[PDB]
Each structure stands twice: as structure tokens, then as C-alpha cells.
Amino acid sequence: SQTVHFQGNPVTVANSIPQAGSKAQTFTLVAKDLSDVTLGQFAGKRKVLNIFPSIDTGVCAASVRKFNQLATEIDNTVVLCISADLPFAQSRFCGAEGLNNVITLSTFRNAEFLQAYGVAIADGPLKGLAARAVVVIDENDNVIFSQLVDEITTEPDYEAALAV
Amino acid sequence: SQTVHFQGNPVTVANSIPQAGSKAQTFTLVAKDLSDVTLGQFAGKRKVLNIFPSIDTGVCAASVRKFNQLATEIDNTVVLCISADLPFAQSRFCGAEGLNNVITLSTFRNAEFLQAYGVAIADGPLKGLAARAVVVIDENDNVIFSQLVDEITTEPDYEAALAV
């Protein structure tokens, strides 16, 4: 239903990513301590969903850290860096060092999240992983911004991190 | 269903692990390069399925490597270290590297394998991961040995590495 690219080859992404003005769908993901975490646990806060195919590349790009840093600077915000890496691997993420309101969440046992949010790679070598995307949700669980990055290895625009 | 333990607490594992004497069911797993791999590709060899909840916990047990080393001592052997960890994190496995015929395979997009081989943890925080277990499959693809470890944090019987 959506198509991005990787290694010079197109990639299929199931359904469609949330649209501004829409009520955010609930979801459950796993934290670094293996506990479950839902959207409602962040009620009354601004949520920035930073979705990656993987946050365990072993590379600390300045662009990635900058985005997270910008996102957390907006009032009453929480940044959720989401991927299919297991919580174990997510600890190696170096794109949010020292940012207290940045949380890593795994999708390893909640594949429905990827379907509902329209970021599930449906084919190619990266099948089973999440596409690169950003979804911003406000204090009233309303989506005010979303972006599915055309090129998987590319980062989203910094503007996304600052959506309201 | 079956019951084992995680840090002393009861844990339910789906279905039943293959028993000695049963026929090994085919399966599709993902290798390090993200390519699909099936049991048939190891036809003619002795396959030792070394299944872990995770092989990317930051702690390297000396026991792990020795077990794998011993397994490779038996004629025509290939050791498959399987877990839910993504191919990206399985690369950091210490129990493999340095030893020939010891490869890591991921179930990240083939969760049904855990169900079919009866090693899918059904409850608690380790839900979605594989139980600690060993299944030895011979040249005729018959299961000649298996163990679903009582305490998931402990290591299997070394006799497992040598089963026929």
C-alpha cells in the first residue's frame, strides 16, 4: 500500500501511515526491562515516535542524535525510538545519550503495531523490520504530523522533530 | 504446553519439544546476511539446534563456547545457534565466532518455528523469546536428542553437545 526504497531496490510497506488530525491508535511495545508499555501510559504528553529499521547499526550519526535532541526540547515531550531490535540490542543505541525523555521500545512481540501504524516492511531482505518513519502525537493523542522516509537509510527532516 | 523456570519462577512453553525418535519438522530461519535458510539445506549432516532466549545479553559464558566446540567434535556436524535476536545482534555472539560450522539463525520473521519446535515462551516478560533448549537431528533428519532446560538462565547438559 506504500512503497519506499533500499539499496537501489523498491520496498513494500503495508497499509498507510497515520495522517494529521487523526486519533492515534493505541499500541503495546516492550521496554528495556521487558515490561509492556502502551500509549496511554504517556497520556497528557506529546509523543514523538521515532521509527527505525534498526537502531543497532554500530554507527552514531550526528544527524540521528540531533533529531532526538530537537524532539525532546519541545515542552512536555517523550521520544519513543521504536524498532524490531530486541530490548537487549537497543541499549547500544547512541543517538540519544543523556536525553532522559527518550525511551527505546521493541516490536519483537507486537507486530500488530507495525501494521496499524503502516511501517511494516512486507518484502525484500528487510521483511519483518520497521520502515524509517516519524509520527508526532499531541497531548490529546491526536496525530499532528507523520512522515514515511522514502529512502530507508536516510533520516527524516528535522522539522518533524519540532511539530508543535 | 510444558513448564520450565526463569530465575526460579514457573514459565509456560508452547506445545512440546521434539522428542527423541520423532521426525524433525522442516523450518525456515534467517541467516546473518538476511537470507532465508531451511533445514533441508543441511541435508546429510548432524544438526545441533542450540536454542537461546537471547545470544546478545552482553555476558559471554565460557560454557557456551565449550559446548559448541564439543558439538563440532562429532562427525559431520553443523551447530545452529537459534534465537529471536535480529541477524544484526547475533553477530556479537561469542559462543560462535572462532569455530567453524557454528552458525547463528534468527526467528525474527519466522516465529512459527518456536511454536513448531515447542520452545516458544508463552508468558511472563520473556514472552515471545525462545526457551533455552537443545535438539539434535541426525543425517536421516530424525531427532535423536532434545532437552528443554529446566532453568532458562542455566546452560544445557554437555551430553547434549555429544548426542550421537
- Residue B128 near residue A108, CB atoms below 8 Å: yes
List the A143-148 sheet strands across, edge first.
A36-38, A28-30, A102-106, A77-83, A46-51, A133-137, A143-148
> Which residues lie closer than 8 Å to A94 by C-beta, 6 or more apart?
A60, A65
- Which of A20, A43, A60, A94 is labelled catalytic? A60
Q: Which residues 6+ apart lie within 8 Å of B71 measured at CB? A: B48, B50, B77, B79, B102, B161, B162
CA A19, A22, A28: angle at the middle one, nearest 5? 95
**A56: which chain B residues are within 8 Å (Cβ-Cβ)?**
86, 88-89
Domain that holds residue A39: 1-164
**A2 neighbors A15 (Cβ within 8 angstroms):** yes
What sign does the CA torsion over A108, B47, B156, B115 have?
positive
What is the DSSP secondary-structure string of B67-110? HHHHHTTSTTEEEEEEESS-HHHHTT-TTTTTSTTEEEEE-TT-
Contact in structure between A61 and A95 (CB atoms under 8 Å): yes
Report how far residue B116's alpha carbon sits from residue A156's, in angstroms, rounded to the nearest whole number: 40
Q: Which of B28, B82, B88 to mutate to test the interface with A (most CBs of A within 10 A)?
A: B88
**CB atoms inside a 10 Å sphere around CB B137:** 26
Cα separation, A157 vs A154, whole angstroms: 10
This structure was determined by X-ray
Which residues of A fall within a CB distance of 8 Å from B126? 34
Query: What does the alpha-carbon distance between residue A51 and residue A104 come to, in Å, rounded to a whole number?
Result: 10
A60 has catalytic annotation = yes
In angstroms, the CA B22 to CA B14 distance is 18
Three-state SS for A60?
A: coil
Alpha helices by DSSP H, chain A: 62-72, 87-90, 112-116, 158-161
Radius of gyration of chain A, Cα coordinates, nearest whole angstrom: 14
- Residue type at B17? I
Residue found by looking up cell 561469542 in the block? B94
Specify the DSSP class assigned to residue A138: -
User: What amino acid occupies position B39?
Assistant: L
Strand partners, A7: none
Q: Which helix (H) or strand (E) holds B112?
A: helix B112-116
Q: Are the C-beta atoms of residues A91 and A85 closer than 8 Å to each other?
A: no
**Do B89 and A85 make contact, defined as CB atoms within 8 angstroms?**
yes
- Resolution in Å, one decimal, please: 2.2
Domain count, chain A: 1
CATH code of the domain covering residue A150:
3.40.30.10
